[PDB]
């Protein structure tokens, strides 16, 4: 599963670097160049989504009220609820990833940094499991970079 590996690599690095400010220097791996451009597209579009919709996102975060490990469960089920809908497009996908980064920042502030990687895997698992066909047809993360050129 190369799509899953690449998706996790992109989403995990974005969430961690958004939460800590630290960039991960380790090599990518297979299809490394496309992942680096996806991540650059993600910083550009995703940082913007977070800035331009901080009020809405914070109200959403407030609803989830995340103060402990068990609260962290609710986050994946929101992901499942969306991706279980039949509609698929890159705007939904980048928006859910961006909300993941917003919640990752929170988790760091609440001394739950160890929860960020599981959060990233849950996002990746749901995205790839539920939308594999659609993603494949866009040429995976190459379509993402080209859609947001």
């Amino acid at each position: 599963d190369e799509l899953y590996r690449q998706s996790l690599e992109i989403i995990s690095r974005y969430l961690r670097e958004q939460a800590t400010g630290a960039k991960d220097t380790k090599p990518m791996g297979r299809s490394g160049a496309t992942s680096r451009k996806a991540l650059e597209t993600l910083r550009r579009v995703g940082d913007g989504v977070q800035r331009n919709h901080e009020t809405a996102f914070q109200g959403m975060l407030r609803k989830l009220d995340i103060k402990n490990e068990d609260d962290v469960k609710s986050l994946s089920r929101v992901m499942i609820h969306v991706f279980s809908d039949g509609v698929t497009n890159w705007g939904r996908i980048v928006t859910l990833i961006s909300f993941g980064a917003f919640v990752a920042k929170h988790l760091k502030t609440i001394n739950q940094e160890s929860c960020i990687e599981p959060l990233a895997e849950s996002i990746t698992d749901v995205l790839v499991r539920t939308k594999r066909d659609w993603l494949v047809k866009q040429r995976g993360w190459d379509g993402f970079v080209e859609f947001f050129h």
């Binding site: 579009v45 959403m60 509609v87 890159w90 705007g91 939904r92 996908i93 928006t95 947001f148």
Partner: peptide, 19 residues
């Protein structure tokens, strides 16, 4: 109806870049 607010926001963002 949080779910529906996120979907709605994502569809907005999709429309903007599809133009």
């Amino acid at each position: 109806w949080l779910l529906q607010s996120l979907l709605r926001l994502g569809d907005e963002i999709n429309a903007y870049y599809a133009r």
